[PDB]
Amino acid sequence: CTSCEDNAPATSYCVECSEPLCETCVEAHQRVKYTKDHTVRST
Amino acid sequence: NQCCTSCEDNAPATSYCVECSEPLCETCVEAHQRVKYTKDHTVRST
Ligand SMILES: [Zn+2]
Ligand SMILES: [Zn+2]
Ligand SMILES: [Zn+2]
Ligand SMILES: [Zn+2]
Numbered sequence: 001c002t003s004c005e006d007n008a009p010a011t012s013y014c015v016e017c018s019e020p021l022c023e024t025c026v027e028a029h030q031r032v033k034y035t036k037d038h039t040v041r042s043t
Numbered sequence: 044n045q046c047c048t049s050c051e052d053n054a055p056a057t058s059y060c061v062e063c064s065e066p067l068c069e070t071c072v073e074a075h076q077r078v079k080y081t082k083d084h085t086v087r088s089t
Pocket of ligand 1 (some may be wrong): 004
């Protein structure tokens with residue numbers, strides 16, 4: 001995950017951002033209005 | 044005094060974001076920091 005510095009494994013991928021995300025950053029992605037409608041897929 | 048209206052938690056706003064022009068609760072502030080689009084927003088404690 002390169003959206004945080006928790007050195008956490010990416011367990012998801014956002015299509016629009018083309019970014020792997022950890023579970024914490026997925027939850028943040030869903031809470032922020034600009035990103036809440038992004039297509040986030042489990043990896 | 045104010046609720047955060049950027050989530051449905053009916054949580055107290057402790058901050059405001061200049062770029063969003065929105066009061067934010069602690070959970071929303073933390074989320075703001077973890078999303079690349081909002082990470083550099085000017086979030087000010089109230
Ligand atoms: Zn992360
Ligand atoms: Zn995204
Ligand atoms: Zn909130
Ligand atoms: Zn903002």
